[model samples]
Target: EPKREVCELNPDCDELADHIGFQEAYRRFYGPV
Candidate 1:
């Protein structure tokens, strides 16, 4: 299960959660460009 409630308690956690998906997609599409 996702620690969504924990992330909600911390800004950094929320930022990471928000970006992880986009980061993975960027890597897949751009290959570290």
Candidate 2:
């Protein structure tokens, strides 16, 4: 999809952006380590 925030800011973010899905990564996906 488009440049989402969660996907980059969140860990898992298996879905859309923050103002939308914004779910936990549970393990790891993006964001700072």
Candidate 3:
């Protein structure tokens, strides 16, 4: 049988990186908390 992997947060790491980048941009525009 083939092995299977599980993604707890997201199936794609790229998606997570994109989300983090968006948050950084948002904070830069509005100032950090």
The candidate with the higher TM-score, 2 or 3, is: 3
* RMSD each, Å: 8.0, 7.1, 11.6
Instruction: Order the candidate numbers by TM-score, best to worst.
Output: 1, 3, 2
Model 2 misses residue 2 by how many Å?
8.5
Weakest ten-residue segment in model 1 by summed lDDT: 22-31
Q: Per-residue lDDT tens digits of candidate 2, residues 1-33?
A: 333444664443644334354334422344448
lDDT of 1 at 30: 40
In order, what lDDT does every prediction score?
A: 0.51, 0.44, 0.37
- TM-score of every model versus the real structure: 0.45, 0.20, 0.29
Residue range with the least summed lDDT across 10 consecutive positions in model 3: 1-10
Clashing pairs in 1: none
What lDDT is reached at residue 18 by model 3?
57
lDDT of 3 by residue, 1-33 (tens): 111112223345334435665444334443446
Q: Once superposed on the true structure, which residue ranges of model 3 sit more than 4 Å away at CA? A: 1-20
* After superposition, candidate 1 runs with Cα above 4 Å error: 21-33
